[PDB]
């Protein structure tokens, strides 16, 4: 087993509806499946899309979880992704901040 | 079922990942139908396939499809170009997002 490296995907409004921003976490290079992701300890569920993992040439998996939030919230609300990789007994809580 | 065009979100490498001497571009593709897309990545204008890993599209809860594509680079590769692009082709139409260091 290998636990993931988790990186923040800082918010961007380029691709979202007006007045919203997409932010996320990149869950890189773990094995085996699965990883679970929540946001703000399960309190944030609206606008969350956790994508199916990719299997890479290395034989390791990566996935991303993205949440679309109001742009007005970026200064006022902390966003943390809670990543759990049970097979490696790894948990990461990654704060995702504006750049 | 009617054709639905993909929404594409592209994230550059995080500063944190760069500090770990790694870099990953993340191209997220959602809400398309039918469930076949192709992805092309470019460093500036030059197509690249090394380091590209793309999922097979899977059905979302709304009967449309999602996919993701990743381009794994060295920090030096990332910083050496003016930009990188993720180009998603679906049913003969393309959506291209570009990010820069």
UniProtKB/Swiss-Prot annotation, chain A:
Q: Which stretches of sequence are listed as region CH1?
A: 1-96
Give every Ig-like domain span: 4-97
- Taken from the UniProt record, the cysteine pairs bridged by disulfide bonds within this chain are 25-81
Annotated segments matching region Disordered: 1-19
Domain of life assignment: Eukaryota
Q: Describe its partners and assembly state.
A: Immunoglobulins are composed of two identical heavy chains and two identical light chains; disulfide-linked. Interacts with FCGR1A; this interaction mediates IgG effector functions on monocytes. Interacts with FCGR2A and FCGR3A.
- Per its database record, what is this protein's job? Constant region of immunoglobulin heavy chains. Immunoglobulins, also known as antibodies, are membrane-bound or secreted glycoproteins produced by B lymphocytes. In the recognition phase of humoral immunity, the membrane-bound immunoglobulins serve as receptors which, upon binding of a specific antigen, trigger the clonal expansion and differentiation of B lymphocytes into immunoglobulins-secreting plasma cells. Secreted immunoglobulins mediate the effector phase of humoral immunity, which results in the elimination of bound antigens.
Q: Which disease is it linked to?
A: Multiple myeloma: A malignant tumor of plasma cells usually arising in the bone marrow and characterized by diffuse involvement of the skeletal system, hyperglobulinemia, Bence-Jones proteinuria and anemia. Complications of multiple myeloma are bone pain, hypercalcemia, renal failure and spinal cord compression. The aberrant antibodies that are produced lead to impaired humoral immunity and patients have a high prevalence of infection. Amyloidosis may develop in some patients.
Name the UniProt record assigns to this protein: Immunoglobulin heavy constant gamma 1
> Parent protein range shown?
3 to 101 of 399
Swiss-Prot record, chain B:
* Listed Gene3D superfamilies: Immunoglobulins
* GO cellular component: a single term: IgG immunoglobulin complex
Membrane-spanning intervals of the chain: none
Q: Which domain of life is it from?
A: Eukaryota
Compartment(s) where it occurs, according to its Swiss-Prot or TrEMBL record: Secreted; Cell membrane
Q: What is this protein called?
A: Immunoglobulin lambda constant 2
What is the documented function of this protein? Constant region of immunoglobulin light chains. Immunoglobulins, also known as antibodies, are membrane-bound or secreted glycoproteins produced by B lymphocytes. In the recognition phase of humoral immunity, the membrane-bound immunoglobulins serve as receptors which, upon binding of a specific antigen, trigger the clonal expansion and differentiation of B lymphocytes into immunoglobulins-secreting plasma cells. Secreted immunoglobulins mediate the effector phase of humoral immunity, which results in the elimination of bound antigens.
Name the species this protein comes from: Homo sapiens (Human)
What SUPFAM superfamilies does the annotation carry? Immunoglobulin
Record's subunit section: Immunoglobulins are composed of two identical heavy chains and two identical light chains; disulfide-linked.
Q: Which InterPro entries match?
A: Ig-like_dom (IPR007110), Ig-like_dom_sf (IPR036179), Ig-like_fold (IPR013783), Ig/MHC_CS (IPR003006), Ig_C1-set (IPR003597), MHC/Immunoglobulin (IPR050160)
Any single GO molecular-function term of the entry would be:
antigen binding
UniProt keyword terms in alphabetical order: Adaptive immunity, Bence-Jones protein, Cell membrane, Disulfide bond, Immunity, Immunoglobulin, Immunoglobulin domain, Membrane, Secreted
> What is a single Pfam family found in this protein's UniProt entry?
C1-set
Q: What are the Ig-like domain coordinates in residue numbering?
A: 6-100
Q: Cross-referenced PROSITE patterns, in alphabetical order?
A: IG_LIKE, IG_MHC
Which SMART domains does this chain map to? IGc1
Which residues form each disulfide bond in the chain? 27-86
Gene Ontology biological process terms in this record: immunoglobulin mediated immune response
Fill in the misc note: Displays the following serological isotype: Mcg-, Kern- and Oz-. The Mcg- isotype marker is characterized by Ala-5, Ser-7 and Thr-56; the Ke- marker by Ser-45 and the Oz- marker by Arg-82.
